[PDB]
Each structure stands twice: as structure tokens, then as C-alpha cells.
């Protein structure tokens, strides 16, 4: 999250197996993110190959 936060990236993709690991994060690191909580590679490719047609 830090490496996506310093590089000016906003919407990050993390595995939902880290959702319980997400609440570890403080309320300042999660300032300005929108994690597309995913568990299947198919959904990452659905929400990232979005300009498919």
C-alpha cells in the first residue's frame, strides 16, 4: 500500500485473504485508496482489462 501510495496510484488490488490483515492498517495509510478486494485472477482481469472491447 505504501509503494502504491507514494507512486501516485489510487485504486489498488489486494487479495481478500488480507482483508483481516487490512484492519491492521491505520486510518492514515488508507487515506485516498479504493482496494478492489479480489480472490480470483479472473476478477482482477475483469476490473483491469476493462478496455477489452
Amino acid at each position: 500500500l505504501l509503494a502504491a501510495h507514494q507512486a501516485g496510484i489510487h485504486k489498488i488490488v489486494l487479495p481478500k485473504d488480507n482483508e483481516a490483515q487490512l484492519e491492521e492498517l491505520p486510518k492514515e495509510v488508507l487515506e485516498g485508496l479504493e482496494i478492489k478486494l479480489v480472490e480470483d485472477v479472473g476478477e482482477v482481469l475483469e476490473y483491469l482489462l476493462l478496455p477489452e472491447p
Partner: protein, 72 residues
């Protein structure tokens, strides 16, 4: 402590389609060599991964032979 980084005494793993939870003895301690296998389509072949010896290869081949002895 932190969150429970490992699940409780394993009864909540919810059996998956392909992976077989096989045990073995790595030199750094115990583990389960979950032999996660890919039932890919195609035209018939067999490969491996992990950069291991062929012993895994003939073990898999003999396994496949026993399956083909019990196809239907």
C-alpha cells in the same frame, strides 16, 4: 498479538478442486507440499515445476498409469 495469521486447528479449509495436501519433510521444518496441479485443456502432455529431480516425474507418470487403469 496480531490477527491470527494462520487459521485455527485446520478444520476450516473447505476442500478445493485440484490441490492435494501432501505432507513431507523440508530441511527447514515440516510443511504440506500442496501439489497444486493444473487440469489444462490441450492434446496430451505432462510437465512439472519447482526445478526438481525426475523422481517426481516417474511418480506422477505411475500415478497417471493407475488412473488410466481406472478411467471410467
Amino acid at each position: 498479538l496480531g490477527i491470527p495469521r494462520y487459521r485455527p486447528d485446520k478444520a476450516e479449509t473447505e476442500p478445493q478442486v485440484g490441490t492435494a495436501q501432501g505432507l513431507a519433510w523440508t530441511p527447514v521444518g515440516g510443511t504440506l507440499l500442496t501439489i497444486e496441479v493444473a487440469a489444462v485443456p490441450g492434446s496430451g502432455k505432462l510437465s512439472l515445476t519447482g526445478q526438481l529431480g525426475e523422481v517426481m516425474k516417474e511418480s506422477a507418470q505411475a500415478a497417471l498409469t493407475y488412473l488410466r487403469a481406472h478411467t471410467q
